[PDB]
């Protein structure tokens, strides 16, 4: 036997950082969950009980905190890049660092119409994420995403004209509910290293904003032919707006809301045009994916 | 043996309702999870395999949908009261109905600065809940709450002057982070029945708003001596503002954010006044509760 | 305003303990999650920012670990009683301690047909729990339970003869699946204090065993008329077998498994006697409860 | 823009099947969660609102139930292969089917020392899974796994001799707790199609058994130098025992159990050789991975 692939490190590292403007009194908080997994000439830790080649996962954990202390933690693409670069540079025998960051929302509170200097609210479980692969000799590969963005529209969703055969029961509809949890990922052009990432720093927050904005507007305004057609419109607009991204991926569940026939009860009419009360279905769910690039 | 207590019914009933203004095109959605448990002369279903006294939980489920079809689902205190009243009136041998409702947020989207007529976003897992106990001969007992409201303040929290003995290691602090998940409950004066509930309908949304507002403002503005002292200030203000509530309950976890001593590494200073990077603790957590009434 | 009720302390305290037989080499592990909430003359911590009366929740946490170090952690009824007794005795102004313990399973592994001396497997998320209320002047009130015991029987469950009216759609059935998550609680006679608890120590593991055994056997062997009738048979047998318990409570979801009509497809027969493939329903679910005591 | 990748279908399809021996009265149950995602000439559903090429996810759902009705659902490698093969054969323009199956445990109950004919218990959340990729023209790629197998050993785990530098605080230890959630995957040799899968059917249950057995025995008996070294021993034995598998992957969290220094309290000794009470850590956790193949 032989080791074909190996990576190890520390997962679920919770991190908070605060910035305090002693001038204005305004504080700003950041909270994330970090995973760092290393690759390199480590196969003998597996095959020969050779721990000498292991940078302890506890030490990886310390390094995450120390790096947060000494560097910006925003945007997460930058923090991820600094952290991964540290491991491959610091340790000769480590040749890749895989950095995953989940950013948790802490939105400044408005109290009586004015932003509060140090109080925050978690306005949803929507996350901003990065996946940063720092590979010695091959630069920095970054995937950015938003996830957990849950939306619903009550009309202007349709689903008709699909294939019909002996396995098909679904009725065509020209007016349905559409609800999903948006998972959207934009893949950056390969960066040659930390310097190139630094040179593009303002583009990270901006592209996240754009992706978020395009998603919400297209969802709200598209009179949707299908989840497939709607998600494609989102991806093409994001690509059009950021030349440094190579692909946009969407993964969308179709979280079904079923009509409830109540005509068996006093002839109550609750279907089609009379549909008022629906049963949200927890499972099963459609799952629709696509990766869009440029022609 | 004998049955000392019994209740049965349907839990986790997911319900959606839409309202459509055909005049304006504006749609409004409501989504909830409902539980209805009945009590009454049902002990022989347990002791004698006498199913004749059972209103099927499947029928309870149907009844929830039918009631949503034929009545307002807002405010949830009213819907809960109508639903519970239905069971005790419809079935002679049913003498109490216990209605729990969790309301899920669907906040209208703003697209390019304007509210969209039929698109919504789940802006957090914060819930609005009710517990409605409809008891034949003894009216309607309503508990209203907000839960899952997650907040953090980065300063203006303190914890010193607590009891110190041989079990105490905790250092006194005059400046810490405070973060919690707010669970707040206001208990209404007993209502004599559905008519009395109806007579107070506008007070339900208003008192929820007040509770929410008082919570957020007191959290943001109190230079907190402890979770105990802060939560009491919230409760007393809510009581002061709604004479029809008898008590206000808070249940607050203290979600700890620990300083990280980094002085072992290149003498980095990250404690006290230099504290920038913290480790959020998933567990354990303080849990602080109180029920406040009027003197 | 005034404080009507108050309790505070530390929740989600994870605890492991190991016992090592240096003679035999056999080790035994225990793992739990503990919550301790105190009551007493603490209202001024809420109303007057008077922290002097607060035994820090961090100190409560320390005390849980120290108590585990110096006392048996099994049975959990005893450990809970020692822990609660400690707080009301140690602190004059603390008058009740509320101790909740969740015990996690670590079952010794058998390797090649022989029990291993120090390796364990989590054979399910079923828990053994206690709720121990230690109230100064009023002894120790103990509720013991098993929860998360998930079972299914594929036949010998029936549900017919229930009330039928205009809200009823459910078909009567003489052969269905029954599946539940068993939550069963036995309430002990009040104990006067820690000494009385000590005097009954062997009865705790034994009564848990009995409850577990009666549950599984009655579930497997009862040709069930309903969840109600089956659960009552469990409770009455447990009561018959332990005079020191006053009541037995069951809370059982009916986790529905629906037939799937496939006759629309090539006349496939998959209902009634031909029913082979079913759709397990995640929600809604029946929820059936009863508290049984002696006549 | 252009579609670079696309797949769509139905996720979280819960399925139960029962087998009844009318001769013996013995029933056997199977329960799973299924996801089927299709690929093919479907890009115009995304780019042109062309639903004609969509096999409805609702129809995919029906097909899963119908396939379960008409075929064995065990072993899951076979069921997955039949299901995926169906889509690529039935639909000319569908060229791959991705079938993920999670199998839930329903272990026959023993009642008074004898196996019960139709009653079952969920003896843990451990799963048996498959990932079956059916690709037209390129056969069937199968990955089998066990996951959620949670174990602990109380001694005979060590971790010393690892790299020490200015980021290292962790003390070397020659006796620690080791606990993990085992995720183990064996990758089968490519199969040319459904016939080849059929020809190996008995090897699926057998290799799952072997993997399970090797995991538990190696965990219990290895005096572990590290998670890395232990997991490698598991993988090499599995490979040695099934020539038709090409690689074995492990993904293991190191679920840390920390010593608790209690010497600050009455000089209590609870570290090193005196270590009895530990604090299980929910996060962070080590995460150790490797993919082992043959030399
Ligand atoms: O937008 C949809 N896409 C599908 O592929 C599909 N399939 C289905 O049943 N409903 C829908 N809806
Ligand atoms: O606000 C607090 N209340 C307490 O009761 C307590 N106890 C503790 O350890 N920290 C805190 N903080
Ligand atoms: O055992 C049952 N009890 C009920 O009360 C009930 N109600 C229902 O719809 N199914 C069942 N099954
Ligand atoms: O078995 C281990 N492997 C590691 O790589 C590691 N790192 C760490 O901190 N503890 C351990 N333990
Ligand atoms: Cl779908
Ligand atoms: Cl606290
Ligand atoms: Cl039921
Ligand atoms: Cl580790
Ligand atoms: Na390197
Ligand atoms: Na009645
Ligand atoms: Na006392
Ligand atoms: Na095909």
A111 touches chain B (CB under 8 A): yes
Q: Which residues line ligand 1 (CB under 6 A)?
A: A 159, 170, 226-228, 254, 286, 288; D 8, 54, 56-58
Q: D123–C124: do the CB atoms touch at under 8 Å?
A: yes
Closest-approach residue (CA) in chain A for D37: A287
Which of C164, C168, C226, C231 is the pocket-test mutation for ligand 3 (most atoms within 8 Å of CB)? C226
Q: D166–B282: do the CB atoms touch at under 8 Å?
A: no
User: Distances from the Cα of B169 to the Cαs of A210, B272, C50, C62, D280, in angstroms?
Assistant: 49, 17, 20, 8, 20
Residues of chain D positioned with their CB less than 8 A from the CB of B282: 282-283
Q: Which of D7, D232, D254 sits opposite A57 (nearest CB)?
A: D254
Active site residue B173: no
Ligand 2 center from residue B256 Cα (angstroms):
10
User: Residue A290: helix, strand or coil by DSSP?
Assistant: strand
Q: D65–C31: do the CB atoms touch at under 8 Å?
A: no
Using DSSP bridges, classify how beta strands A127-135 and A140-153 pair: parallel, antiparallel or unpaired: antiparallel
Please enumerate in sequence order all residues whose Cβ is within 8 A of that of C10, keeping only pairs 6 or more positions apart, or say none. B284, B285, B286, B287, C34, C35, C36, C57, C58, C60, C61, C64
Cα dihedral across residues B84, B87, B92, B93: positive or negative: negative
B27 pairs with which residues across the strands? B20
C168 touches chain A (CB under 8 A): no
CB A244 within 8 A of CB A203: yes
b/e code B234-263 from CB counts within 10 Å (16+ = b): bbbbbbeebeebebbbbbbbbbbbebbebe
Token pair belonging to A73: 């933690």
Q: A262–B149: do the CB atoms touch at under 8 Å?
A: no
For the beta carbon of residue A223, count every other beta carbon within 10 angstroms: 10
Q: Is the peptide bond before D284 cis (omega within 30 degrees of 0)?
A: yes
Q: A217–B268: do the CB atoms touch at under 8 Å?
A: no
B285 touches chain A (CB under 8 A): no
D65 phi and psi angles, rounded to 5 deg: -65, -45
The verdict on the CB of residue C54 being under 6 Å from ligand 2 is yes
CB D290 within 8 A of CB A3: yes
CATH number at residue D63: 3.10.270.10
C266 touches chain B (CB under 8 A): no
Ligand 8 center from residue B234 Cα (angstroms):
44
Cα dihedral across residues B244, B250, B251, B253: positive or negative: positive
Domain with B278, as residue range(s), is 1-295
Neighbouring subunits of D (3+ Cβ pairs under 8 A): A, B, C
CB B85 within 8 A of CB B140: yes
Q: Which of B4, B161, B254 sits opposite C52 (nearest CB)?
A: B161
DSSP run (H or E) holding A88: helix A76-90
CB A224 within 8 A of CB A286: no
User: Distances from the Cα of D9 to the Cαs of A280, C295, D64, in angstroms?
Assistant: 19, 57, 11
Ligand 1 center from residue B145 Cα (angstroms):
37
The verdict on the CB of residue C53 being under 6 Å from ligand 2 is no
Residue with tokens 């021993």: D233
Closest-approach residue (CA) in chain A for D232: A46
B17 pairs with which residues across the strands? A277, B30
Q: What is the DSSP letter of C219?
A: H
Active-site residue (options: C28, C57, C74, C247) = C57
What DSSP letter does each residue of chain D carry, written as one string?
-EEEEEEEEEEEEEEEEEEE-TTT--EEEEEEEEEEEEEES-HHHHHS--GGG-B-HHHHHHHHHHHHHHS---SHHHHHHHHHHHHHHH-TTEEEEEEEEEEEP-EEEEETTEEEEEEEE---S-EEEEEEEEETTS-EEEEEEEEEEEEEESSSB-B-S-B-STT--PPPBSS--EEEEEEEEEEEPPBSSHHHHHHTHHHHHHHHHHHHHHHHHHHHH--BS-HHHHHHHHHHHHHHH-TTEEEEEEEEEE--EEE---TTTTT---SGGG--EEEE--S-EEEEEEEEE--
A77 phi and psi angles, rounded to 5 deg: -60, -40
Please enumerate in sequence order all residues whose Cβ is within 8 A of that of A98, keeping only pairs 6 or more positions apart, or say none. A7, A9, A35, A36, A37, A38, A39, A84, A131, A132, A133, A134
User: In chain A, how many domains are there?
Assistant: 1
Ligand 2 center from residue C55 Cα (angstroms):
8
Residues of chain A positioned with their CB less than 8 A from the CB of C167: 265
A174 touches chain D (CB under 8 A): no
CB C17 within 8 A of CB C68: yes
Among D257, D283, D284, D285, the strongest candidate for a mutation testing the B interface, having the largest count of B CBs within 10 A, is D283
The verdict on the CB of residue B157 being under 6 Å from ligand 2 is no
CA of C11, closest CA in chain D: separation in Å? 14
Name the nearest CA neighbour of C88 among C34, C41, C32, C35.
C41
Ligand 7 center from residue B247 Cα (angstroms):
34
For chain D, report the end-to-end CA distance as a whole number of angstroms: 43
Q: Which of A68, A217, A268 sits opposite B111 (nearest CB)?
A: A217
Neighbouring subunits of A (3+ Cβ pairs under 8 A): B, C, D
Show which of residues 147-166 on chain C sit within 8 Å of chain A, judged by CB atoms. Answer: 166
Which ligand 4 atom is nearest residue D178's CA? 1
Name the nearest CA neighbour of A175 among A278, A292, A273, A84.
A273
Q: How far apart are CA A105 and CA D71, in angstroms?
A: 48
Q: How far apart are CA A173 and CA C14, in angstroms?
A: 52
Residues of chain C positioned with their CB less than 8 A from the CB of D112: 217
Q: Is the peptide bond before D75 cis (omega within 30 degrees of 0)?
A: yes
CA of B167, closest CA in chain D: separation in Å? 7
Q: C151–D120: do the CB atoms touch at under 8 Å?
A: yes
Token pair belonging to B215: 């919570």
Token pair belonging to A288: 């629709």
Q: How far apart are CA C257 and CA D15, in angstroms?
A: 9
Ligand 6 center from residue C59 Cα (angstroms):
10
CB B101 within 8 A of CB A103: no
User: Residue C95: helix, strand or coil by DSSP?
Assistant: strand
For the beta carbon of residue B93, count every other beta carbon within 10 angstroms: 13
Q: B120–A151: do the CB atoms touch at under 8 Å?
A: yes
User: What 3 state SS string does chain B have?
Assistant: CEEEEEEEEEEEEEEEEEEECCCCCCEEEEEEEEEEEEEECCHHHHHCCCHHHCECHHHHHHHHHHHHHHCCCCCHHHHHHHHHHHHHHHCCCEEEEEEEEEEECCEEEEECCEEEEEEEECCCCCEEEEEEEEECCCCEEEEEEEEEEEEEECCCECECCCECCCCCCCCCECCCCEEEEEEEEEEECCECCHHHHHHCHHHHHHHHHHHHHHHHHHHHHCCECCHHHHHHHHHHHHHHHCCCEEEEEEEEEECCEEECCCCCCCCCCCCHHHCCEEEECCCCEEEEEEEEECC
b/e code C234-260 from CB counts within 10 Å (16+ = b): bbbbbbeebeebebbbbbbbbbbbebb
User: Residue A100: helix, strand or coil by DSSP?
Assistant: strand
Name the nearest CA neighbour of B55 among B23, B16, B88, B25.
B88
Name the nearest CA neighbour of C15 among B230, A262, B284, D15.
B284
Show which of residues 236-255 on chain D sit within 8 Å of chain C, judged by CB atoms. Answer: none
Q: How far apart are CA C31 and CA C34, in angstroms?
A: 10
**Catalytic positions of A:** 10, 57, 256
Which of D58, D62, D63 is the pocket-test mutation for ligand 1 (most atoms within 8 Å of CB)? D58
The verdict on the CB of residue C120 being under 6 Å from ligand 2 is no
Q: What count of residues does chain C have?
A: 295
Please enumerate in sequence order all residues whose Cβ is within 8 A of that of C273, keeping only pairs 6 or more positions apart, or say none. none
Q: How far apart are CA A178 and CA A176, in angstroms?
A: 6
Q: Which of C54, C240, C249 sits opposite B163 (nearest CB)?
A: C54
Using DSSP bridges, classify how beta strands A178-188 and A245-254 pair: parallel, antiparallel or unpaired: antiparallel
Closest-approach residue (CA) in chain D for C266: D66
Residues of chain B positioned with their CB less than 8 A from the CB of A222: none
Neighbours of ion ligand 12 (CB under 5 A): D 88, 94
Q: Which of C65, C106, C219 sits opposite D152 (nearest CB)?
A: C106
Residues of chain A positioned with their CB less than 8 A from the CB of D12: 283-285
Q: How far apart are CA C69 and CA D76, in angstroms?
A: 47
């Amino acid at each position: 036997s032989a080791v074909k692939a190996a990576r190890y490190g520390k997962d679920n590292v919770r991190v908070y950082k605060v910035h305090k403007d002693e001038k204005t009194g305004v504080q700003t908080v950041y909270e994330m969950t970090v995973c760092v997994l290393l690759e390199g000439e480590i196969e003998t830790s597996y095959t020969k009980a050779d721990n000498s080649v292991i940078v302890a996962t506890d030490s990886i954990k310390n390094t995450i905190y120390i790096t947060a202390k000494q560097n910006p933690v925003t945007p997460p693409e930058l923090f991820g890049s600094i952290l991964g670069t540290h491991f491959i540079e610091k340790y000769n025998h480590i040749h890749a660092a895989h950095v995953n960051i989940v950013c948790h929302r802490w939105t400044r509170m408005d109290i009586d119409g004015k932003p509060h200097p140090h109080s925050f609210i978690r306005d949803s479980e929507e996350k901003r994420n990065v996946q940063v692969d720092v590979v010695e000799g091959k630069g920095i590969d970054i995937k950015s995403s938003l996830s957990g963005l849950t939306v619903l529209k009550s009309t202007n969703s349709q689903f008709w004209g699909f294939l019909r055969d002996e396995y098909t029961t679904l009725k065509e509809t020209w007016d349905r509910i559409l609800s999903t949890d948006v998972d959207a990922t934009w893949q950056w052009k390969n960066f040659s290293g930390l310097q190139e990432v630094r040179s593009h720093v303002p583009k990270f927050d901006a592209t996240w904003a754009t992706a978020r904005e395009v998603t919400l507007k297209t969802f709200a305004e598209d009179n949707s032919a299908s989840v497939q057609a709607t998600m494609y419109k989102m991806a093409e607009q994001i690509l059009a707006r950021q030349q440094l991204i190579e692909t946009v991926e969407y993964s969308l569940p179709n979280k079904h809301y079923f009509e409830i026939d109540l005509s068996w009860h006093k002839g109550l009419q609750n279907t089609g045009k009379n549909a008022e009360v629906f049963a949200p279905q927890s499972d099963p769910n459609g799952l629709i994916k696509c990766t869009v690039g440029r022609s």
